[PDB]
Amino acid sequence: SGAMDKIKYSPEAKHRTVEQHAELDAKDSIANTDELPSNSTYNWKNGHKPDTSTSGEKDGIVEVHYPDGTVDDVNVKVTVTS
Ligand code: NA
């Protein structure tokens, strides 16, 4: 037996504040990518990319894809200013 990557690692959300119409790289919403394997990849969950076209408080979900194929879902928040 062994611990799969999504059990070993503990990604934590970073709250970002961005301007209306800003781009959002999913990795930028994870606070501790230095505590996760550097070959992990980050993407927005389908249907859960924060929409920066309007200002307000938005929610999103980051998928953290680990090298062993397991995946962590991370709830994040994005403040959009106008
Ligand atoms: Na985890």
Residue numbers in the entry: 226 to 307
Q: What is written in the article reporting this PDB entry?
A:
Proteins attached to the surface of group A and group B streptococcal human pathogens that contain tandemly arrayed Rib domains have been associated with invasive infections and proposed as potential vaccine candidates. Here, we study Rib domains from Rib, R28, and from a surface protein from Lactobacillus acidophilus. Together, these 5 structures of homologous Rib domains, and further sequence analyses, show Rib is an example of domain atrophy, a rare event in domain structural evolution involving the loss of core secondary structure elements, and also reveal the remarkable structural malleability of this domain family. The structure, molecular dynamics simulations, and small angle X-ray scattering of a Rib domain pair suggest tandemly arrayed domains are likely to form an elongated rod on the bacterial cell surface, thus suggesting a possible mechanism of immune evasion mediated through domain number variation.
Structures of single Rib domains with ∼38% sequence identity were solved: RibR (S. agalactiae Rib; amino acids 230 to 308) and R28N (S. pyogenes R28; amino acids 230 to 307). A 1.8-Å resolution structure of R28N was solved using the structure of RibR as a search model; the Cα root-mean-square deviation (rmsd) between RibR and R28N is 1.0 Å. RibS belongs to the “Rib” subfamily, giving a Cα rmsd value of 0.6 Å for superposition with both RibR and RibR28N, versus a Cα rmsd of 2.3 Å for RibL. As predicted, the Ig-fold D/E strands missing from RibR and R28N are also missing from RibS but are present in the RibL structure. Antibodies against, or intranasal immunization with, Rib conferred protection in animal models of GBS infection while antibodies to R28 conferred protection in an animal model of S. pyogenes infection. Cross-protective immunity has been observed on immunization with Rib and R28 against strains expressing the noncognate antigen.
